[PDB]
PDB file of N, CA, C and O in Angstrom:
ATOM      1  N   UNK A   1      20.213  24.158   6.164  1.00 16.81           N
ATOM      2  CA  UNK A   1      20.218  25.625   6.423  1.00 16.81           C
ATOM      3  C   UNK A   1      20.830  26.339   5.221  1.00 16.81           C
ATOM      4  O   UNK A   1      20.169  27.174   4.602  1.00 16.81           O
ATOM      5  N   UNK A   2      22.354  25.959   4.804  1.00 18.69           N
ATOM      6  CA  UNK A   2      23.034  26.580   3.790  1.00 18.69           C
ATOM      7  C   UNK A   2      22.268  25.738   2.655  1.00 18.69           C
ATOM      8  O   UNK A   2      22.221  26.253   1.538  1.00 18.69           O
ATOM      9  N   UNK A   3      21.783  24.726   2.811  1.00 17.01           N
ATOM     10  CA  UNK A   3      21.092  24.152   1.558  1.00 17.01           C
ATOM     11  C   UNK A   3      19.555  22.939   2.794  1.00 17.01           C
ATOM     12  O   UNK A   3      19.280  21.740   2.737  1.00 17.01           O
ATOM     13  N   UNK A   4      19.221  23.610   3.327  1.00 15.78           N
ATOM     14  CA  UNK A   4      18.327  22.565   3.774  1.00 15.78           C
ATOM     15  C   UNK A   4      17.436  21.834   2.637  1.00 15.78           C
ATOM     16  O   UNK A   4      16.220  21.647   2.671  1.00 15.78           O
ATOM     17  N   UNK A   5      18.335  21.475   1.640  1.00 15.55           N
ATOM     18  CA  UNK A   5      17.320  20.650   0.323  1.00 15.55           C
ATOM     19  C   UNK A   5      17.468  19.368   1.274  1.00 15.55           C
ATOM     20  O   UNK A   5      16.429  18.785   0.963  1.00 15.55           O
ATOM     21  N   UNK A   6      18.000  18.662   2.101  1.00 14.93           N
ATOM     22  CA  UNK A   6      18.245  17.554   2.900  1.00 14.93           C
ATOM     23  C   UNK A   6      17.240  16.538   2.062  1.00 14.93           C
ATOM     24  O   UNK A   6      17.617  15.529   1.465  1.00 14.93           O
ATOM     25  N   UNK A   7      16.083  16.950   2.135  1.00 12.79           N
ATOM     26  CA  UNK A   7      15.156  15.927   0.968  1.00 12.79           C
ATOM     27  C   UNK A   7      14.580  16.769   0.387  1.00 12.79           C
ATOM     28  O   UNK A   7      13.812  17.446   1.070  1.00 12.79           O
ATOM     29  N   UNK A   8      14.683  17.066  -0.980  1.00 13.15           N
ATOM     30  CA  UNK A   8      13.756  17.963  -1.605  1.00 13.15           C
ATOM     31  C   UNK A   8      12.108  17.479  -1.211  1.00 13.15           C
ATOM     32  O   UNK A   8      11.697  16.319  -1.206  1.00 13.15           O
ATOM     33  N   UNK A   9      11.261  18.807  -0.867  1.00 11.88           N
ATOM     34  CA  UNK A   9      10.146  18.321  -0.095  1.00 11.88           C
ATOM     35  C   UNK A   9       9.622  18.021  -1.264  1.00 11.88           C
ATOM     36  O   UNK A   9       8.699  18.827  -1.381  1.00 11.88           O
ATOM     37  N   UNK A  10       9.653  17.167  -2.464  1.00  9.74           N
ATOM     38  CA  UNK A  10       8.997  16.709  -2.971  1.00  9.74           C
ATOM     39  C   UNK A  10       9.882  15.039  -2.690  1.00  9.74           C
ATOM     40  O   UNK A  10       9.297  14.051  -3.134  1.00  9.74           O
ATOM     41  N   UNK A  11      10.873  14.884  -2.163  1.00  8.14           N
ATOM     42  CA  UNK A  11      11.114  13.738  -1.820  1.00  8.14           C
ATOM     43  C   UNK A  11      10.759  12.829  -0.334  1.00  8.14           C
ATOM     44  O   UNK A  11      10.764  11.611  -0.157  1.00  8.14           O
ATOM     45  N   UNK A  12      10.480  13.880   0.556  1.00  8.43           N
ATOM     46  CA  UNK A  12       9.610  13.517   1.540  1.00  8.43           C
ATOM     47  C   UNK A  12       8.215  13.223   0.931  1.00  8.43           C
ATOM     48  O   UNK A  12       7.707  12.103   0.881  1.00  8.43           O
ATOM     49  N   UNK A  13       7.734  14.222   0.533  1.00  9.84           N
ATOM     50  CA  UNK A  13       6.156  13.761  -0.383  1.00  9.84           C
ATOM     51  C   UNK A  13       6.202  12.909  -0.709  1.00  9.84           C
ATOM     52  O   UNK A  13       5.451  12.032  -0.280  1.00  9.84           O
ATOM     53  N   UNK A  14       7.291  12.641  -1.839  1.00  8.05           N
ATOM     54  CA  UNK A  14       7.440  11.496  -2.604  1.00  8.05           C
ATOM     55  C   UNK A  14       7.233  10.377  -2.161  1.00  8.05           C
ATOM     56  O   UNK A  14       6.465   9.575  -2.691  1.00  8.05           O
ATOM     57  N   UNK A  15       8.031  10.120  -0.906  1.00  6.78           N
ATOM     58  CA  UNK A  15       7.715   9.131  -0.434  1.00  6.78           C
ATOM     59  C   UNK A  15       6.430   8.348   0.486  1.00  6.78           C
ATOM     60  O   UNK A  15       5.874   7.296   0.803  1.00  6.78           O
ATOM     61  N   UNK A  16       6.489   9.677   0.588  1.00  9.01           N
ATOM     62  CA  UNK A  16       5.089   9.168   1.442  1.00  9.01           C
ATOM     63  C   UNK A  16       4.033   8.894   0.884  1.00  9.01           C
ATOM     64  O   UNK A  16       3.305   8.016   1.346  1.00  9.01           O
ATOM     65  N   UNK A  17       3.679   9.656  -0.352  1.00  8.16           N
ATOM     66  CA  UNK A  17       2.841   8.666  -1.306  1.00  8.16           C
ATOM     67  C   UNK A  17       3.330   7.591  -1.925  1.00  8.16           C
ATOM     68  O   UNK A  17       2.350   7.135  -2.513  1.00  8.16           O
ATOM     69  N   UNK A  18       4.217   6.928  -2.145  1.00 10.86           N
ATOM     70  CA  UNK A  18       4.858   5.952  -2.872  1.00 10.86           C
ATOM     71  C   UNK A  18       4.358   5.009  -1.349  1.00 10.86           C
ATOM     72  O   UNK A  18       3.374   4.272  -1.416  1.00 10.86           O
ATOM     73  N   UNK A  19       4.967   5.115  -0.344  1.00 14.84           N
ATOM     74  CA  UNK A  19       4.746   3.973   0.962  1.00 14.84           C
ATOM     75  C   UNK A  19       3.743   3.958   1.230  1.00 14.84           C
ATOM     76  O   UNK A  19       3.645   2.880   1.817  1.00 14.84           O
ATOM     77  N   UNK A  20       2.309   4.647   1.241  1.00 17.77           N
ATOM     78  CA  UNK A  20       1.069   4.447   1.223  1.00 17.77           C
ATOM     79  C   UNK A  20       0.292   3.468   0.233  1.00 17.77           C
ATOM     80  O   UNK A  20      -0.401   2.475   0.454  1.00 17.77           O
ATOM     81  N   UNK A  21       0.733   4.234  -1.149  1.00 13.57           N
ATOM     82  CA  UNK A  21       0.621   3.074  -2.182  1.00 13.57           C
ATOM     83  C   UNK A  21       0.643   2.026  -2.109  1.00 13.57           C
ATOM     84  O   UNK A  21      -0.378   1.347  -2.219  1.00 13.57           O
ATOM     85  N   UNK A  22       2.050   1.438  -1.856  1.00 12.16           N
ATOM     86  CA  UNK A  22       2.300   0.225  -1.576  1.00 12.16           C
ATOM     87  C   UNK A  22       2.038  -0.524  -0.633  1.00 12.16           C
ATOM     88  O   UNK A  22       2.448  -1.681  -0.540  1.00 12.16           O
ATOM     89  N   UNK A  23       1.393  -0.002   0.099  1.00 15.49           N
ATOM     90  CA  UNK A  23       0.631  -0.576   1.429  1.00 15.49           C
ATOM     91  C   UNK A  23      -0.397  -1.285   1.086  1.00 15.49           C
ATOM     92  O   UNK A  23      -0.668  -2.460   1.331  1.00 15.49           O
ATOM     93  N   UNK A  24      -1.221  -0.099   0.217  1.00 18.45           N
ATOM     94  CA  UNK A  24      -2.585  -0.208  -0.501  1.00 18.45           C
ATOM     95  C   UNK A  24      -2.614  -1.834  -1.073  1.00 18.45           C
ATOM     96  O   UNK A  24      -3.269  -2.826  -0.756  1.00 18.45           O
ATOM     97  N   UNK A  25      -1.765  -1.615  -1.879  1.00 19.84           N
ATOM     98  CA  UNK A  25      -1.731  -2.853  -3.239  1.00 19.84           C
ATOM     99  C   UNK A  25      -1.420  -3.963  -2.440  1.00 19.84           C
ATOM    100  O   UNK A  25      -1.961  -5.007  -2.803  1.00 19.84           O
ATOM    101  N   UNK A  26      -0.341  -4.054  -0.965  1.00 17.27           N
ATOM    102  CA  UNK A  26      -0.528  -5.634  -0.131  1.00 17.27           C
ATOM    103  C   UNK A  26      -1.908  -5.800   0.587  1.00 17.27           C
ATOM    104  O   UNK A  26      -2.203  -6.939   0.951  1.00 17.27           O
ATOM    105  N   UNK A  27      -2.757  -4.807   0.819  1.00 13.02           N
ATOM    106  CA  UNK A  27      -3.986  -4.919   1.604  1.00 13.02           C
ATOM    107  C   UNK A  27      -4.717  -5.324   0.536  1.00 13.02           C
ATOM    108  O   UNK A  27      -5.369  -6.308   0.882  1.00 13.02           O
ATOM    109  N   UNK A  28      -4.985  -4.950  -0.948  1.00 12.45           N
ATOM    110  CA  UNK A  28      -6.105  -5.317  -1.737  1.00 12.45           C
ATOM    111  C   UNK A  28      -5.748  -6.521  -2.503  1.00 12.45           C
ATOM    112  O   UNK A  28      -6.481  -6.964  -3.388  1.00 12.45           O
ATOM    113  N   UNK A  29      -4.461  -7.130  -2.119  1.00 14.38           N
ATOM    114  CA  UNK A  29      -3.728  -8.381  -3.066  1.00 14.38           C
ATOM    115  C   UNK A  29      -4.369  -9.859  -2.064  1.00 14.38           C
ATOM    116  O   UNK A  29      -4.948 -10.846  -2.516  1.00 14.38           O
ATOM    117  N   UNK A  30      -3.940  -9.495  -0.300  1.00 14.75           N
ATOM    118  CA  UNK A  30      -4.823 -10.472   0.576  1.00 14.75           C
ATOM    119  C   UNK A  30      -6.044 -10.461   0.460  1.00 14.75           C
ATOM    120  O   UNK A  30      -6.707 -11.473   0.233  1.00 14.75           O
ATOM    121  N   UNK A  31      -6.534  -9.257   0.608  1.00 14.66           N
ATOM    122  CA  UNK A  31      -8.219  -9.470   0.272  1.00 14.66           C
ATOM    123  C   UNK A  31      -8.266 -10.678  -1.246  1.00 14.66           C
ATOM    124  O   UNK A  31      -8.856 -11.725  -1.512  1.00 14.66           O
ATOM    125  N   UNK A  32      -7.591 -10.061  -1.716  1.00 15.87           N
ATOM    126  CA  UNK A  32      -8.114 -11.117  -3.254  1.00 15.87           C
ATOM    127  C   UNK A  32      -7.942 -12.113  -3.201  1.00 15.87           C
ATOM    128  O   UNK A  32      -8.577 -13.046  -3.693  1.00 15.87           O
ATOM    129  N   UNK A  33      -6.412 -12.094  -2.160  1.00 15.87           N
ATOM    130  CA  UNK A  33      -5.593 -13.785  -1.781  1.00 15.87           C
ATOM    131  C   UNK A  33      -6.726 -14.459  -0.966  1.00 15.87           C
ATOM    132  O   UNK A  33      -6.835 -15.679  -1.084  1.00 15.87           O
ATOM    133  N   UNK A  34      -7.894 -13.553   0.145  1.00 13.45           N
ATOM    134  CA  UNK A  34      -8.290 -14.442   0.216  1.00 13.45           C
ATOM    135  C   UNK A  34      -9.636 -15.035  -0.243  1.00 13.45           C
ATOM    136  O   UNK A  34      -9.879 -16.234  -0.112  1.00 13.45           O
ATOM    137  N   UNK A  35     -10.460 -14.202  -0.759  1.00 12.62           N
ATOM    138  CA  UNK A  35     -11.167 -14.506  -2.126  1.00 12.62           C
ATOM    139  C   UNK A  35     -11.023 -15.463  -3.332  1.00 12.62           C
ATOM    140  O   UNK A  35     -11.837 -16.370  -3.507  1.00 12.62           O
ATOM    141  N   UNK A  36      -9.708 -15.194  -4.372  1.00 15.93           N
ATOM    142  CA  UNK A  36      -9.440 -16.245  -5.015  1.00 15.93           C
ATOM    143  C   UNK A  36      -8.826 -17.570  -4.569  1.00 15.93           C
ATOM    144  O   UNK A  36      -8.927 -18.591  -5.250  1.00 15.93           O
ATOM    145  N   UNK A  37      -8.073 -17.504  -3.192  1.00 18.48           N
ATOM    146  CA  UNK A  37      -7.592 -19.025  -2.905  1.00 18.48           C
ATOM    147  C   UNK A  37      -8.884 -20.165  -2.728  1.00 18.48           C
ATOM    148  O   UNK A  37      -9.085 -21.378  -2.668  1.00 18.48           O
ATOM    149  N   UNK A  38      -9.747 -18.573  -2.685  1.00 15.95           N
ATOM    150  CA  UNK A  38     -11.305 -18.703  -2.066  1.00 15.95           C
ATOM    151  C   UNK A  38     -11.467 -19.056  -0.698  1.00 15.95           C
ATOM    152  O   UNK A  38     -11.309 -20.112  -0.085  1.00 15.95           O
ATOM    153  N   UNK A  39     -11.956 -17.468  -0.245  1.00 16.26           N
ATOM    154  CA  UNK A  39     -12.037 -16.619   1.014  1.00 16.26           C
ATOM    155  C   UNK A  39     -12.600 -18.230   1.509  1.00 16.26           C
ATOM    156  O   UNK A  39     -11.890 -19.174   1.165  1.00 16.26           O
ATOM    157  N   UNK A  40     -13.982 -18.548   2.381  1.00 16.64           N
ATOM    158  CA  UNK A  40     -13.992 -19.558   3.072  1.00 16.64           C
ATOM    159  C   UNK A  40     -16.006 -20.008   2.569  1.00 16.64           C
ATOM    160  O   UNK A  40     -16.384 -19.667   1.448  1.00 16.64           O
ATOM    161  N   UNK A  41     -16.613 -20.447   3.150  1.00 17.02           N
ATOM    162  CA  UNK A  41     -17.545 -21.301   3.642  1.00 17.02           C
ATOM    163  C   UNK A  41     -18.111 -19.961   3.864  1.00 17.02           C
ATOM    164  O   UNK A  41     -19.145 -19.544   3.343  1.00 17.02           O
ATOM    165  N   UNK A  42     -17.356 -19.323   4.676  1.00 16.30           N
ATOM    166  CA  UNK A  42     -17.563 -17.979   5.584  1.00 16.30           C
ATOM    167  C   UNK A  42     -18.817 -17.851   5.348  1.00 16.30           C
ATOM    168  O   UNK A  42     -19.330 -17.113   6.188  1.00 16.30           O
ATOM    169  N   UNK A  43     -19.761 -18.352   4.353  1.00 14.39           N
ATOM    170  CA  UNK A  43     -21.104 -17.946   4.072  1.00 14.39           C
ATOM    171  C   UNK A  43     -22.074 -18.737   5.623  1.00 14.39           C
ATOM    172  O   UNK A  43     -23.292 -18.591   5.728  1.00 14.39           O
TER     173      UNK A  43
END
């Protein structure tokens, strides 16, 4: 209120693109993990 900077709303932003990100990069690292361990037969 006297300073509601509590998170500068670029640090809420901030984060929330930063934790999306990093979501991203473990979802497209398994896909690859399971591709290069080499996904399966699956064919």
């Amino acid at each position: 209120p006297e300073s509601p900077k509590g998170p500068d709303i670029l640090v809420v932003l901030l984060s929330v693109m930063g934790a999306i990100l990093l979501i991203g990069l473990a979802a497209l690292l398994i896909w690859k993990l399971l591709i290069t361990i080499h996904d399966r037969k699956e064919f």
